[PDB]
Structure formats: C-alpha cells, structure tokens
Design an enzyme around this catalytic site. Structure first.
Site, mmCIF file in Angstrom:
data_model
loop_
_atom_site.group_PDB
_atom_site.id
_atom_site.type_symbol
_atom_site.label_atom_id
_atom_site.label_comp_id
_atom_site.label_asym_id
_atom_site.label_seq_id
_atom_site.Cartn_x
_atom_site.Cartn_y
_atom_site.Cartn_z
ATOM 1 N N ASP B 25 -14.024 -1.655 5.447
ATOM 2 C CA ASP B 25 -13.749 -1.328 6.871
ATOM 3 C C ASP B 25 -15.007 -1.304 7.686
ATOM 4 O O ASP B 25 -15.769 -0.316 7.728
ATOM 5 C CB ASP B 25 -13.064 0.038 6.879
ATOM 6 C CG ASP B 25 -12.483 0.430 8.210
ATOM 7 O OD1 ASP B 25 -12.811 -0.306 9.194
ATOM 8 O OD2 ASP B 25 -11.724 1.437 8.289
ATOM 9 N N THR B 26 -15.342 -2.331 8.440
ATOM 10 C CA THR B 26 -16.488 -2.453 9.266
ATOM 11 C C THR B 26 -16.387 -1.511 10.452
ATOM 12 O O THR B 26 -17.415 -1.284 11.057
ATOM 13 C CB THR B 26 -16.675 -3.902 9.776
ATOM 14 O OG1 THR B 26 -15.579 -4.327 10.534
ATOM 15 C CG2 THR B 26 -16.846 -4.863 8.565
ATOM 16 N N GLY B 27 -15.233 -1.010 10.799
ATOM 17 C CA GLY B 27 -15.092 -0.060 11.887
ATOM 18 C C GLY B 27 -15.281 1.374 11.445
ATOM 19 O O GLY B 27 -15.232 2.298 12.259
#
Lengths: 99, 99
Positions: B25-27
């Site tokens: 999850d880059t967020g």
C-alpha cells in the site's frame, strides 16, 4: 515516471480543467477527489472516511490526467482530506509496483 | 517482482516465522499486521481503523520478508482486517511505482 516511496507519492493531476495534487495509492480500489466543479450526471454513494462515512458523487467516464498520462474511469467526488488515485485509474496508466 | 494493479497487490510475507498475506500500500505511511505471537519489547500506540481507533503494539527493528525480500523496520501489530505493508517497509525493499 519511476517514483520511490521515501515521501508520499504525490503527483499533479488534471481533472475538470483544474490542477490538483493527488496521492497514488495502490491500497485503494477506487479514486476519491475533493469537492469540485464538474459537468454531467452522477450517482450518490457513501464510502468510509476519517471519522465516519462520507457522501460522494460517483462520476463515470471522467477524463483525468495523472502526471501527464490520460485515463478514463470513475471518480468519486466528495469531502476527502487527500485526493486519492486508486487502482481503478492506476491500471489505466499502466502503473506497476516494482522491486 | 513487477506487480500490476488489476487485482489487489497481495503478496506473501514472513514475520515472526509465520507466513501471512499482506497488501502493498503506497498510500500507507506505516505497516500494520494482525495480532500475532512476537518476542521482544513494544510501545502502545493508537491508529485509525475501520469504525474508529485501534490499539496497536509498536515493534521496532523487526525483520520481515516481503515476497522474498528482507527488510528491517517498525511494525504495528493489532486487530486490522487487512495486513498492510506501508512505505516504511516498501522503501527498504527498493519498491517503486512505475508508469
């Protein structure tokens, strides 16, 4: 581009003729953008937000430019604290996670 | 690997000698893993969760393998519905977003 993750992966998007900053989020299924001026029809939806649920307008077939790459897809428009580009649009620009 | 985003970017991780499935999850700034057996000292923290806040244990200097790549960093352990690998560990395996 090739974006490393030392900082949040924030890019410039263009939607409804407006430039905004948005987070590229592989953990998000869908795309959520702050309230704004858009033309066209929409359907009401609710999604999870900070503090509880939030009310969004679902717009289909919206043209959006993501760091210069044009994409067509659905955008949820409502009062989010962060503009989030989710997988529904990341797939349209050919985005991959690489390691 | 090179992961496309048509489906959720779920990979196998190894932590505390256990295999688990986790979302890249880059967020997410930080990494959150379901309750489990781990050795060592920890500090209590609270973070946002579905429904409200959740209580986590912060473990520092944890070795974790992410799709076969070993990383050292902080892991928050608590009752999350999805194991999330955030940027704190994605940076350690050299992960980039590419388009």
């Amino acid at each position: 581009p090739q974006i490393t993750l030392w900082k949040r992966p924030l890019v410039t998007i263009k939607i409804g003729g407006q430039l905004k900053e948005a987070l590229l989020d592989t953990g998000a299924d869908d795309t959520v953008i702050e309230e704004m001026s858009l033309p066209g029809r929409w359907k009401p939806k609710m999604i999870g937000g900070i503090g509880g649920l939030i009310k969004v307008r679902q717009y289909d077939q919206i043209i959006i430019e993501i760091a210069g790459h044009k994409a067509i897809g659905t955008v949820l428009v409502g009062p989010t604290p962060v503009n989030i580009i989710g997988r529904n649009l990341l797939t349209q620009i050919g985005a991959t996670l690489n390691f």
